[PDB]
Amino acid sequence: ERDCRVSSFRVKENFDKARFSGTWYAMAKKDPEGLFLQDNIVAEFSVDETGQMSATAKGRVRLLNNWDVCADMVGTFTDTEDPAKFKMKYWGVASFLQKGNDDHWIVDTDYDTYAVQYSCRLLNLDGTCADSYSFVFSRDPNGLPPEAQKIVRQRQEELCLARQYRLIVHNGYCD
Numbered sequence: 001e002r003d004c005r006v007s008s009f010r011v012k013e014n015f016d017k018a019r020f021s022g023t024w025y026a027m028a029k030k031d032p033e034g035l036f037l038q039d040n041i042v043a044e045f046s047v048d049e050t051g052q053m054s055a056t057a058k059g060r061v062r063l064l065n066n067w068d069v070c071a072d073m074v075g076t077f078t079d080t081e082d083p084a085k086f087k088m089k090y091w092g093v094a095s096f097l098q099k100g101n102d103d104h105w106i107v108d109t110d111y112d113t114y115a116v117q118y119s120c121r122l123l124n125l126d127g128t129c130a131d132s133y134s135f136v137f138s139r140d141p142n143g144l145p146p147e148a149q150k151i152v153r154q155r156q157e158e159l160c161l162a163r164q165y166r167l168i169v170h171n172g173y174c175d
Protein backbone atom coordinates (compact mmCIF):
# COMPACT_ATOMS: atom_id res chain seq x y z
CA GLU A 1 0.00 0.00 0.00
CA ARG A 2 2.44 2.66 -1.24
CA ASP A 3 1.05 6.18 -1.70
CA CYS A 4 1.41 6.77 -5.46
CA ARG A 5 -0.49 10.09 -5.59
CA VAL A 6 1.45 12.80 -7.44
CA SER A 7 0.76 15.40 -4.72
CA SER A 8 2.20 13.11 -2.01
CA PHE A 9 5.61 12.82 -3.75
CA ARG A 10 8.58 14.64 -2.20
CA VAL A 11 11.08 16.82 -4.11
CA LYS A 12 14.53 18.36 -3.58
CA GLU A 13 14.31 20.65 -0.53
CA ASN A 14 15.92 24.09 -1.01
CA PHE A 15 16.65 23.42 -4.70
CA ASP A 16 19.56 25.51 -5.97
CA LYS A 17 19.27 26.51 -9.64
CA ALA A 18 22.83 27.88 -9.91
CA ARG A 19 24.45 24.70 -8.52
CA PHE A 20 22.31 22.54 -10.84
CA SER A 21 23.78 24.36 -13.89
CA GLY A 22 26.24 22.68 -16.26
CA THR A 23 26.16 19.42 -18.21
CA TRP A 24 23.93 16.48 -17.22
CA TYR A 25 24.13 13.08 -18.94
CA ALA A 26 20.94 10.99 -18.84
CA MET A 27 21.99 7.38 -18.15
CA ALA A 28 18.52 5.88 -17.54
CA LYS A 29 14.96 6.89 -18.44
CA LYS A 30 11.29 6.03 -18.01
CA ASP A 31 9.17 6.70 -21.11
CA PRO A 32 5.70 8.25 -21.47
CA GLU A 33 3.15 7.16 -24.09
CA GLY A 34 3.85 8.18 -27.70
CA LEU A 35 7.01 9.56 -29.31
CA PHE A 36 9.95 10.36 -27.01
CA LEU A 37 13.74 10.87 -26.93
CA GLN A 38 15.57 7.56 -27.49
CA ASP A 39 19.20 7.96 -26.36
CA ASN A 40 22.30 10.24 -26.34
CA ILE A 41 20.25 12.58 -24.13
CA VAL A 42 22.47 15.37 -22.76
CA ALA A 43 21.08 18.41 -20.92
CA GLU A 44 22.86 21.73 -20.33
CA PHE A 45 21.33 23.93 -17.61
CA SER A 46 22.00 27.65 -17.07
CA VAL A 47 20.82 30.61 -14.96
CA ASP A 48 20.81 34.33 -15.89
CA GLU A 49 21.13 37.62 -13.94
CA THR A 50 17.46 37.63 -12.88
CA GLY A 51 17.73 34.04 -11.56
CA GLN A 52 15.48 32.37 -14.14
CA MET A 53 16.67 28.88 -15.08
CA SER A 54 16.95 27.71 -18.69
CA ALA A 55 18.40 24.71 -20.53
CA THR A 56 19.21 23.14 -23.88
CA ALA A 57 18.71 19.43 -24.60
CA LYS A 58 20.05 17.18 -27.37
CA GLY A 59 19.03 13.59 -28.12
CA ARG A 60 18.37 10.95 -30.78
CA VAL A 61 14.76 10.38 -31.87
CA ARG A 62 13.41 7.39 -33.81
CA LEU A 63 10.63 8.97 -35.89
CA LEU A 64 9.81 6.18 -38.33
CA ASN A 65 11.54 2.79 -38.60
CA ASN A 66 14.16 4.18 -41.03
CA TRP A 67 14.80 7.77 -39.85
CA ASP A 68 17.10 8.91 -37.02
CA VAL A 69 17.02 12.56 -35.94
CA CYS A 70 19.30 14.39 -33.51
CA ALA A 71 16.77 16.68 -31.83
CA ASP A 72 18.21 19.97 -30.55
CA MET A 73 15.88 21.84 -28.19
CA VAL A 74 15.89 24.92 -25.95
CA GLY A 75 13.71 25.53 -22.88
CA THR A 76 12.84 28.04 -20.17
CA PHE A 77 11.64 27.23 -16.63
CA THR A 78 9.01 29.25 -14.76
CA ASP A 79 9.21 29.29 -10.95
CA THR A 80 6.43 28.00 -8.68
CA GLU A 81 5.68 28.14 -4.93
CA ASP A 82 7.85 25.01 -4.59
CA PRO A 83 11.54 25.68 -5.42
CA ALA A 84 12.08 22.22 -6.98
CA LYS A 85 8.97 22.29 -9.22
CA PHE A 86 8.97 24.23 -12.51
CA LYS A 87 6.84 24.75 -15.63
CA MET A 88 9.08 23.95 -18.60
CA LYS A 89 8.29 25.65 -21.92
CA TYR A 90 10.38 24.13 -24.73
CA TRP A 91 10.91 24.29 -28.50
CA GLY A 92 13.17 22.85 -31.23
CA VAL A 93 15.84 24.63 -33.29
CA ALA A 94 16.98 21.74 -35.54
CA SER A 95 14.17 19.32 -36.44
CA PHE A 96 11.17 19.73 -34.10
CA LEU A 97 8.86 22.44 -35.48
CA GLN A 98 6.23 22.87 -32.75
CA LYS A 99 6.46 23.91 -29.08
CA GLY A 100 5.17 22.27 -25.89
CA ASN A 101 5.15 22.41 -22.10
CA ASP A 102 5.60 19.99 -19.18
CA ASP A 103 6.14 20.06 -15.44
CA HIS A 104 9.81 19.72 -14.49
CA TRP A 105 10.37 18.32 -10.99
CA ILE A 106 13.85 17.79 -9.56
CA VAL A 107 13.05 14.93 -7.18
CA ASP A 108 16.53 14.66 -5.64
CA THR A 109 20.14 15.62 -6.39
CA ASP A 110 23.56 16.28 -4.85
CA TYR A 111 24.47 18.72 -7.69
CA ASP A 112 27.88 17.12 -8.50
CA THR A 113 27.24 13.40 -9.24
CA TYR A 114 23.55 12.49 -9.78
CA ALA A 115 20.07 13.93 -10.29
CA VAL A 116 16.58 12.40 -10.50
CA GLN A 117 14.07 14.24 -12.71
CA TYR A 118 10.30 13.60 -12.83
CA SER A 119 7.36 14.86 -14.91
CA CYS A 120 3.69 13.82 -14.78
CA ARG A 121 1.82 14.73 -17.98
CA LEU A 122 -1.60 13.25 -17.14
CA LEU A 123 -3.35 12.60 -13.81
CA ASN A 124 -5.75 9.77 -12.91
CA LEU A 125 -8.99 10.42 -11.00
CA ASP A 126 -7.58 8.74 -7.87
CA GLY A 127 -4.52 11.06 -7.85
CA THR A 128 -1.90 8.75 -9.37
CA CYS A 129 -0.10 9.62 -12.61
CA ALA A 130 -1.56 8.19 -15.83
CA ASP A 131 1.31 9.31 -18.09
CA SER A 132 4.80 10.12 -16.79
CA TYR A 133 8.45 10.33 -17.79
CA SER A 134 11.61 10.46 -15.67
CA PHE A 135 15.38 10.81 -16.19
CA VAL A 136 18.37 9.63 -14.15
CA PHE A 137 20.94 12.36 -14.83
CA SER A 138 24.67 12.14 -14.10
CA ARG A 139 27.67 14.50 -14.27
CA ASP A 140 29.97 11.62 -15.25
CA PRO A 141 28.74 9.54 -18.22
CA ASN A 142 31.02 6.65 -17.12
CA GLY A 143 28.75 5.99 -14.10
CA LEU A 144 27.47 6.97 -10.66
CA PRO A 145 29.14 6.47 -7.25
CA PRO A 146 27.81 3.74 -4.87
CA GLU A 147 25.90 6.25 -2.70
CA ALA A 148 24.27 7.89 -5.74
CA GLN A 149 23.11 4.46 -6.97
CA LYS A 150 21.39 3.73 -3.64
CA ILE A 151 19.49 7.04 -3.55
CA VAL A 152 18.40 6.80 -7.20
CA ARG A 153 17.05 3.26 -6.72
CA GLN A 154 15.20 4.41 -3.58
CA ARG A 155 13.68 7.49 -5.26
CA GLN A 156 12.64 5.49 -8.35
CA GLU A 157 10.76 3.06 -6.10
CA GLU A 158 9.19 5.91 -4.08
CA LEU A 159 7.86 7.41 -7.36
CA CYS A 160 6.09 4.07 -8.08
CA LEU A 161 8.30 3.44 -11.13
CA ALA A 162 10.27 0.40 -9.93
CA ARG A 163 11.67 -1.80 -12.73
CA GLN A 164 10.18 0.55 -15.38
CA TYR A 165 13.42 2.36 -16.29
CA ARG A 166 15.63 1.42 -19.24
CA LEU A 167 19.30 2.34 -19.65
CA ILE A 168 20.34 4.62 -22.54
CA VAL A 169 23.54 4.91 -24.57
CA HIS A 170 25.99 7.78 -25.08
CA ASN A 171 28.00 6.81 -28.18
CA GLY A 172 28.49 10.25 -29.78
CA TYR A 173 25.78 9.75 -32.40
CA CYS A 174 24.87 13.44 -32.06
CA ASP A 175 28.55 14.46 -31.82
Ligand SMILES: O=C(Cc1ccccc1C(F)(F)F)N1CCN(c2ncnc3sc4c(c23)CCC4)CC1
Binds near residue numbers: 037043055073117135
Ligand atom coordinates in the same frame (compact mmCIF):
# COMPACT_ATOMS: atom_id res chain seq x y z
O1 LIG B 1 8.70 15.66 -25.20
C1 LIG B 1 9.72 16.28 -25.45
C2 LIG B 1 10.12 16.47 -26.90
C3 LIG B 1 9.12 15.83 -27.84
C4 LIG B 1 7.91 16.50 -28.02
C5 LIG B 1 6.93 15.98 -28.86
C6 LIG B 1 7.16 14.78 -29.53
C7 LIG B 1 8.36 14.11 -29.35
C8 LIG B 1 9.35 14.62 -28.51
C9 LIG B 1 10.64 13.86 -28.35
F1 LIG B 1 11.65 14.57 -28.83
F2 LIG B 1 10.60 12.71 -29.01
F3 LIG B 1 10.86 13.60 -27.07
N1 LIG B 1 10.50 16.79 -24.47
C10 LIG B 1 10.09 16.62 -23.07
C11 LIG B 1 11.29 16.43 -22.14
N2 LIG B 1 12.29 17.47 -22.42
C12 LIG B 1 13.32 17.53 -21.45
N3 LIG B 1 13.50 16.53 -20.55
C13 LIG B 1 14.47 16.59 -19.62
N4 LIG B 1 15.29 17.65 -19.54
C14 LIG B 1 15.15 18.69 -20.40
S1 LIG B 1 16.18 20.04 -20.31
C15 LIG B 1 15.30 20.68 -21.66
C16 LIG B 1 14.24 19.83 -22.13
C17 LIG B 1 14.15 18.65 -21.38
C18 LIG B 1 13.56 20.50 -23.29
C19 LIG B 1 14.35 21.83 -23.43
C20 LIG B 1 15.48 21.97 -22.38
C21 LIG B 1 12.81 17.16 -23.76
C22 LIG B 1 11.72 17.55 -24.76
Ligand SMILES: [Cl-]
Binds near residue numbers: 035
Ligand atom coordinates in the same frame (compact mmCIF):
# COMPACT_ATOMS: atom_id res chain seq x y z
CL1 LIG C 1 5.32 14.60 -32.84
Ligand SMILES: [Cl-]
Binds near residue numbers: 070073097
Ligand atom coordinates in the same frame (compact mmCIF):
# COMPACT_ATOMS: atom_id res chain seq x y z
CL1 LIG D 1 14.85 19.81 -32.82
